[PDB]
Enzyme design. Structure first.
Site, PDB file in Angstrom:
ATOM      1  N   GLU A 773      10.083  22.789   1.706  1.00 56.18           N
ATOM      2  CA  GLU A 773       9.486  22.329   0.319  1.00 56.18           C
ATOM      3  C   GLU A 773       8.953  23.082  -0.564  1.00 56.18           C
ATOM      4  O   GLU A 773       9.365  22.993  -1.514  1.00 56.18           O
ATOM      5  CB  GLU A 773       8.201  21.168   0.807  1.00 56.18           C
ATOM      6  CG  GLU A 773       7.081  20.444   0.464  1.00 56.18           C
ATOM      7  CD  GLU A 773       6.371  19.738   0.733  1.00 56.18           C
ATOM      8  OE1 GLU A 773       6.325  19.062   1.814  1.00 56.18           O
ATOM      9  OE2 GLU A 773       5.702  18.994   0.163  1.00 56.18           O
ATOM     10  N   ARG A 851      -5.096  15.587   5.190  1.00 53.70           N
ATOM     11  CA  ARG A 851      -4.245  15.123   5.932  1.00 53.70           C
ATOM     12  C   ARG A 851      -4.097  14.628   7.719  1.00 53.70           C
ATOM     13  O   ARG A 851      -5.061  14.457   8.101  1.00 53.70           O
ATOM     14  CB  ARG A 851      -2.570  14.992   5.894  1.00 53.70           C
ATOM     15  CG  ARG A 851      -1.605  14.398   6.776  1.00 53.70           C
ATOM     16  CD  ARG A 851      -0.038  13.941   6.444  1.00 53.70           C
ATOM     17  NE  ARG A 851       0.047  13.811   5.771  1.00 53.70           N
ATOM     18  CZ  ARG A 851       0.389  12.374   4.959  1.00 53.70           C
ATOM     19  NH1 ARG A 851      -0.201  11.042   6.380  1.00 53.70           N
ATOM     20  NH2 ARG A 851       0.804  11.701   3.965  1.00 53.70           N
ATOM     21  N   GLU A1232       8.652  11.607   9.762  1.00 64.16           N
ATOM     22  CA  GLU A1232       6.602  12.150  10.305  1.00 64.16           C
ATOM     23  C   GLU A1232       6.550  11.355  10.963  1.00 64.16           C
ATOM     24  O   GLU A1232       5.890  12.095  12.137  1.00 64.16           O
ATOM     25  CB  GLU A1232       6.156  12.720   9.026  1.00 64.16           C
ATOM     26  CG  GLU A1232       6.742  13.511   8.263  1.00 64.16           C
ATOM     27  CD  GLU A1232       5.775  13.883   7.283  1.00 64.16           C
ATOM     28  OE1 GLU A1232       5.381  13.074   6.508  1.00 64.16           O
ATOM     29  OE2 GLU A1232       5.442  14.990   7.128  1.00 64.16           O
TER      30      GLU A1232
END
Ligand SMILES: Cc1cc2nc3c(=O)[nH]c(=O)nc-3n(C[C@H](O)[C@H](O)[C@H](O)COP(=O)(O)OP(=O)(O)OC[C@H]3O[C@@H](n4cnc5c(N)ncnc54)[C@H](O)[C@@H]3O)c2cc1C
Ligand code: FES
Ligand code: FES
Ligand SMILES: [Ca+2]
Lengths: 1297, 49, 98, 49
Positions: A773, A851, A1232
């Site tokens: 990423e 998160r 995920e």
């Protein structure tokens, strides 16, 4: 002579100047251009480089076939052999049945492991056209896959043994007569006698010895001459420890080193006999001989079970294992315990020795004189009243390095249970294979009884003591295993004495102890995949919701799919190698490149000085391209060597000498807390009234939990090619990345040119998982620079050791929790303080913590809640995105304290979780409303379909009838919010063209990394345009067709790109409709040509933004997520309380993926994600030195799930009738959310340990500690018993990070 | 014409799905693409000029 | 481009259309996978046809930037673009002319 | 075009043309061509897919 002559896919290869350092893998890829065969590790552990070898065997007089790791086979060992690669067996014009079946069964995702797996299965079929299920699984001990979760591979291949995701009935049948001919030239040459060869390379001379006489002469004249047989040890020494042996002799051809002779005392194996041959003759022998004669044979077989895979055992010799003299040899303890007879020779000498402690006098040394070679091993028959056990405990069962390994032998005085001889030998307990020579003599003439048990255990605990700083650490576990293995051997011998009618003298075994002595066996696998059929009325050309195989699966099975390093090199292309700090924090005092400059082909060393514009990179601009003045982790990139070849760049990189002055280092989370070293300020979510919640609570439990990080282990490592165009600073990069946009931006900023000059192209990745990423740019920028400076194309693909060191991983978490709850199990208050170890650079660390905090509730409504996070800034490689992105860590903490709530209350965990679960319409701790809340249906379907309640009772019964094995069973829910936590990243774009033949070229911002994104987008466009998928093609992802793209991440990419594609398609349809109106039947191709010849544009962009997102930490308001994913998993385990090993018996998953775009890809994603989670929570562990140096840098030490790791029974259901109308065609994201459901295994293990502690602990602590990963060490240590008791008793090998 | 650069094509096969990229000295990318695709028997979407 | 200065003219056209310097606009190449179904560069017509194409594509980009221009009438080009991007506004467009 | 660097595995093509204004092709003999070092193949109408 000196020509090397062999065959590749039937074609003759004549190499006139073979270099002994050249591997088969490099020859195939770089010399012959056959890039189907992949580099995954260079260490023999992953199997991506698996190929087949055929030869005429002169000693057995027939054509044989076996598999090898091309990465470790020297081409100089391959004279008069025939190599078959994935290209050799078929291609997409005519697939081999093996290729066809793995493709069509959804057995290929990213595709990078597929050729190697194809070749393992292919080789098995060439040897056994009708294998068993068992033989099929055994063929892949040496092959790793990170994506599939292994289930589909075995399911597709089971069809070779002895609604639907695929149809085995449509699979073409196997015709063995159509396999490639054995090259006739090689059959002619087995008549002519084989003579000695010499090959001379850049630094190494290789002699292929034809006779014993030549080998002895050479060793007498030059004892420095290094024996190489299979090269499975020497390859590792040369590649990774930079050892150079300038003279090599290969004796593999010599008859005397390859013979098998049956004598009166046992079986003699020439020392060059491969372990595969040892296996086959010993299996013949134990099948046909009396049990009383085969005790030692079966001990060797038990070790060889867990010893690498087919690829290694095909060429790894017994002699090689013995002489290697590794402390963790699995065979030497067995040969030592059994007094195996070794014959040694030199020119005109010959002696026989029985292996004993003297054979191994020091670290990696033996009794051999420099000029002696090992000729043979006699593995002995056992005698009447002689019993043998072998043991091995590793981190993982298959292809792993032993922690402790052991051979154990007792001989009884005839007619008695009195000990005549006792031999207990061990690996992994010192710098050599040792015998417990002080302990076993005291036992002679004792009866086999309880006090002999106690005496041997006391002796072992004293003799085999361990240094706190001992290589490997884990000193309690290792010591506990020596006693625990003895105990199993003691019980085993009790039983064997029983079988010799001596039950009355030694006693019967208590029946609750019998499971302690069973040899590992797995039940046959049973799998279920349940999903929803599309409506009856849906057109057969509308593939949305149908199980279409990955568009590239055929090409991936065939080795034709192109990954970055498969791209041919330009004639003028250079190689780059990174040079990294060996210090966690230091000043760079100087750099000396003297030695580097001498390496042939050296071009330059790039450093911060060569950067044209800015040395500041990274997502938050706090990273160097190249270190300036100081290094801030082991793995900090200081510079880059450029040379002609990768070998010359590696050598030159070795000759870059850095001098350092140490600075104070912040390594651990604790270190960072003490030093106030964090990335930014505290992050916080809080709701309700904590003081009041804790007041009203009947009960309050406090604790901590530590969660280890995780290496992505994409099978394809990071790779960039940068091609400079010589004009206007223009450059094109081919990159294995999830983030073309940041790659482009970072290269442009570094060069000081506009973004419009820089094109980044991604055809596909061999996995990403979040690791690509951002962290891929660290390679990309350096290669770009090299390319700008030279004006030449430059390429770098990381070696696995480099990739694992440089690119970081999942964030380790430390959490400190306090939960308040009622006697009913209802939780009323929660406070959690989270700490993460971010490493060197901020990267995505803060978003990951956010998160985690968004998911500290998991599935549970908590009226009074406070969560904090702090990200630690440390002298470690920077940690990044990993599938889950902080969610798994957050949710494991929630479930951990929840487990303790249930146990404190004395209530079933199941009921406690359900009671606390959110309801439809509730708000989260962050005030987002849960609509279309599907979790209760997932839960009720899963509890029912798994028969959780009836299985509870079976588990309880098992636990009451077994003292030394215990089962556990747990059901775990999950809620996972979908969307980037940064709102504006929730955008995507597409571009579509329709050519005048009607064919459609589509592209979007999403990158393919094995998740089947292009497949889904083609499904989507095909429905939107109402044409067949066959007319639509996606070739690649590029910054010059769709700009400003977000990373392929946050599971969001099908949602975003799907909408973008749909909108592009809608624009095209609108422009075609007048033509459709005039000719409502005339085909698509006529409307298209009609639009063209009327000058209507047949090209369109498409774009989508996720609406209504934007959360404030200040007001605790606004929605961070567009919707949530839901699922539930129930898992059952059986632990071995004596070793800490366990079986994953059964897992059942119900997953809400809305109306699936593709149930095949989606069940694939559920299984792949689940299995990565399984690794995270039970097998995967990274170890660092106290000075912050990563020790774990390859599959030898980093143990990802293997074929044999997955739940034996594995059921996946996709929830029916749950359309999610706010995402593309009512789908939900899938990548995920399922990973955290492997939690179920972690909590099943925790239940099993609790049952172990009730069985055997004293006043064992009730809320005992189980950190993640729950490895065999942590499981064994937590099963407190009589054995751990006598083993319990600050400079050391590793530190908790 | 006597363009000082004569006609020139590099074709690079990509090994998957008949995909091919051509670098051409041409005024007509479309007909180049169309003619190549028809000759090979693959859709236009596989051929880049 | 075959020497006739077509890219030069198209950059001049785009720079006027967008009201930015030529230095901020680049043409790298012509390819069938960025613009399909193109007529040959012939009949002297290519600056006429593509100039219109380019102009229209630039008009679409301007239309999309105009709210950001309104709220920052002097702030530079760069601020409008970055504002559009962080508001999840598409910064890519086709243009066509017959 | 021709200034673009060659790939290591890149091959070279040369066209073979008619020396007659209008004729039948009665035969083609490729013997001598096959003896030239580095010769790979001669493409003709039969090779068109
Ligand atoms: C993926 C992988 C997994 C593995 N797993 C295990 C495992 O679980 N357990 C385990 O014990 N090992 C394991 N190994 C080690 C492996 O068994 C040994 O590498 C192997 O047996 C060595 O044999 P070889 O023929 O490859 O040795 P080579 O590498 O060719 O030689 C190794 C050493 O032995 C010497 N030598 C070889 N033959 C003779 C002879 N006749 N006389 C004198 N010296 C000789 C060589 O000079 C050299 O010093 C593993 C290796 C790999 C790559
Ligand atoms: S690359 Fe050979 S085993 Fe991994
Ligand atoms: S599909 Fe096996 S490693 Fe990706
Ligand atoms: Ca970080």
């Amino acid at each position: 002579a000196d020509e090397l002559v062999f065959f590749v896919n039937g074609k003759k290869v004549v190499e006139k100047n073979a270099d002994p350092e050249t591997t088969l893998l490099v020859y195939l890829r770089r010399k012959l251009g056959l890039c189907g065969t992949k580099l995954g590790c260079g260490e023999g552990g992953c199997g991506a480089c698996t190929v087949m070898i055929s030869k005429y065997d002169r000693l057995q007089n027939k054509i044989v076939h076996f598999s090898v790791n091309a990465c470790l086979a020297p081409i100089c060992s391959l004279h008069h052999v025939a190599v078959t690669t994935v290209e050799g067996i078929g291609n997409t014009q005519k697939l081999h049945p093996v290729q066809e079946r793995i493709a069509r069964s959804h057995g290929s995702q990213c595709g990078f492991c597929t050729p190697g797996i194809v070749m393992s299965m292919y080789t098995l079929l060439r040897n056994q056209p009708e294998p068993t299920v068992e033989e099929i699984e055994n063929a892949f001990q040496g092959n790793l896959c990170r994506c599939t979760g292994y289930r589909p591979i075995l399911q597709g291949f089971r069809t070779f043994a002895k609604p639907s995701l695929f149809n085995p009935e449509d699979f073409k049948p196997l015709d063995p007569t159509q396999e490639p001919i054995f090259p006739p030239e090689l059959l002619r040459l087995k008549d002519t006698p084989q003579k000695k060869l010499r090959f001379e390379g850049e630094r190494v001379t290789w002699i292929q010895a034809s006779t014993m006489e030549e080998l002895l002469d050479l060793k007498a004249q030059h004892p420095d001459a290094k024996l190489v047989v299979g090269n499975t040890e020497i390859g590792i020494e040369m590649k990774f420890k930079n050892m150079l042996f300038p003279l090599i002799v290969c004796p593999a051809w010599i008859p005397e080193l390859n013979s098998v002779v049956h004598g009166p005392e046992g079986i003699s194996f020439g020392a060059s006999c491969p372990l595969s041959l040892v296996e086959s003759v010993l299996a013949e022998e134990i099948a046909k001989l009396p049990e009383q004669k085969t005790e030692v044979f079966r001990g060797v077989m038990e070790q060889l079970r867990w010893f690498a895979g087919k690829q290694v055992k095909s060429v790894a010799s017994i002699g090689g294992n013995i002489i290697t003299a590794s402390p963790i040899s699995d065979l030497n303890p067995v040969f030592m315990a059994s007094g195996a007879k070794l014959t040694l020779v030199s020119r005109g000498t010959r002696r026989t020795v029985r292996m004993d402690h003297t054979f191994f006098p020091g670290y990696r040394k033996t009794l051999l004189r420099p000029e002696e070679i090992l000729l043979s091993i006699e593995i002995p028959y056992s005698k009447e009243g002689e019993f043998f056990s072998a043991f091995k405990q590793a981190s993982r069962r298959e292809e792993d390095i032993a922690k402790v390994t052991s051979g154990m032998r007792v001989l009884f005085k005839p007619g008695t249970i009195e000990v005549q001889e006792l031999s207990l030998c061990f690996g992994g307990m010192a710098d050599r294979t040792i015998s417990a020579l002080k302990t076993t003599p005291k036992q002679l003439s004792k009866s086999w009884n309880e006090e002999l048990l106690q005496s041997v255990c006391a002796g072992l605990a004293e003799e085999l003591q361990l240094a706190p700083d001992a290589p490997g650490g884990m000193v309690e576990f290792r010591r506990t295993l020596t006693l625990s293995f003895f105990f199993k051997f003691y019980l085993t011998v009790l039983q064997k004495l029983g079988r010799a009618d001596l039950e009355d003298m030694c006693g019967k075994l208590d029946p609750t102890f019998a499971s302690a002595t069973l040899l590992f066996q797995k039940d046959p696998p049973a799998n279920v995949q349940l999903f929803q059929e599309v409506p009856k009325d849906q057109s057969e050309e509308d593939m949305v919701g149908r199980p279409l195989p990955h568009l590239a699966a055929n090409m991936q099975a065939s080795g034709e799919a192109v990954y970055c390093d498969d791209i041919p090199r330009y004639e003028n292309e250079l190689s780059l190698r990174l040079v990294t700090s060996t210090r966690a924090h230091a000043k760079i005092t100087s750099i000396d490149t003297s030695e580097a400059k001498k390496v042939p082909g050296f071009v330059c060393f790039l450093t911060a000085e060569d950067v044209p514009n800015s040395n500041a990179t990274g997502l938050f601009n706090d990273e160097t391209v190249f270190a300036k003045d100081e290094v801030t982790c082991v793995g900090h990139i200081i510079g880059a060597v450029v040379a002609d070849t990768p070998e010359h760049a590696q050598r030159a990189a070795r000759g870059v000498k850095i001098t350092y002055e140490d600075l104070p280092a912040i390594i651990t989370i604790q270190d960072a807390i003490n030093n106030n070293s964090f990335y930014g300020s505290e992050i916080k979510i809080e709701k309700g009234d904590l003081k009041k919640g804790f007041s009203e609570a009947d009960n309050v439990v406090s604790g901590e939990l530590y969660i280890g990080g995780q290496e992505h282990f994409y099978l394809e490592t990071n790779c960039t090619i940068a091609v400079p165009k010589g004009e206007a600073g223009e450059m094109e990069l081919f990159v294995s990345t999830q983030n073309t946009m940041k790659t482009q931006s970072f290269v442009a900023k570094m060069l000081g040119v506009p973004d419009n000059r820089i094109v980044v192209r991604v055809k596909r990745m061999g996995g990403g998982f979040g690791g690509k990423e951002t962290r891929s740019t660290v390679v990309s920028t350096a290669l770009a620079l090299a390319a700008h400076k030279t004006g030449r194309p430059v390429r770098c693909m990381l070696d696995r050791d480099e990739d694992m060191l440089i690119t970081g991983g999942r964030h380790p978490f430390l959490a400190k929790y306090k939960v308040g709850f009622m006697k009913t199990g209802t939780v009323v208050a929660l406070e959690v303080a989270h700490f993460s170890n971010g490493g060197n650079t901020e990267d995505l660390s803060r978003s990951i913590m956010e998160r985690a905090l968004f998911h500290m509730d998991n599935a549970y409504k908590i009226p009074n809640i406070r969560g904090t996070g702090r990200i630690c800034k440390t002298n470690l490689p920077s940690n990044t995105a990993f599938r889950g992105f902080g969610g798994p860590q957050g949710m494991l903490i929630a479930e951990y304290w929840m487990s303790e709530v249930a146990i404190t209350c004395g209530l079933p965990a199941e009921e406690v979780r359900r009671k606390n679960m959110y309801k439809e319409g509730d708000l989260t701790h962050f005030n987002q409303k849960l609509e279309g809340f599907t979790l209760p249906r997932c839960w009720d379907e899963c509890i029912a379909s798994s028969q959780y309640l009836a299985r509870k009772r079976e588990v309880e019964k098992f636990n009451r009838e077994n003292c030394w094995k215990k089962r556990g069973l747990c059901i775990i829910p999950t809620k996972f919010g979908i969307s980037f936590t940064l709102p504006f990243l929730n955008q995507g774009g597409a571009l579509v063209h329709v050519y005048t033949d009607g064919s459609v070229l589509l592209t979007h911002g999403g990158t393919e990394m094995g998740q089947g994104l292009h497949t889904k987008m083609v499904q989507v466009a095909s429905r939107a345009l109402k044409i067949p998928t066959s007319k639509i093609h996606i070739s690649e992802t590029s910054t010059n067709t769709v700009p400003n793209t977000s990373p392929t991440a946050a599971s969001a990419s099908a949602d975003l790109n799907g909408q973008g594609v749909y909108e592009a398609c809608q624009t095209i349809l609108k422009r075609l409709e007048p033509f459709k109106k005039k000719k409502p039947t005339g085909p698509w191709e006529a409307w298209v040509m009609d639009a063209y010849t009327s000058a209507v544009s047949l090209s369109a962009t498409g774009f989508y933004k996720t609406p209504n997102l934007g959360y404030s930490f200040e007001t605790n308001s606004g929605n961070p997520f567009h919707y949530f994913s839901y699922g539930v998993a129930c898992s059952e385990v059986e632990i071995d309380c004596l070793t800490g090993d366990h079986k994953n018996l059964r897992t059942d998953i119900v997953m809400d993926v809305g109306s699936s775009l593709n149930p095949a890809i989606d069940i694939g994603q559920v299984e792949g994600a689940f299995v990565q989670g399984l690794g995270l929570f039970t097998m995967e562990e990274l170890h660092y030195s106290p000075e912050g140096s990563l020790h774990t840098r390859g599959p030898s030490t980093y143990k990802i799930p293997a074929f044999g790791s997955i739940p034996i029974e594995f059921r996946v259901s996709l929830l029916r009738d749950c359309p999610n109308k706010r995402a593309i065609y009512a789908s939900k994201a899938v990548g995920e959310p399922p990973l955290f459901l492997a939690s179920s295994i972690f909590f099943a293990i925790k239940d099993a340990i609790r049952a172990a502690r009730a069985q055997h602990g004293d006043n064992a602590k009730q809320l005992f500690q189980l950190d993640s990963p729950a490895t065999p060490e942590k499981i064994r240590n937590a099963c407190v018993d009589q054995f751990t008791t006598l083993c319990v008793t600050c400079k050391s090998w590793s530190v908790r990070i």
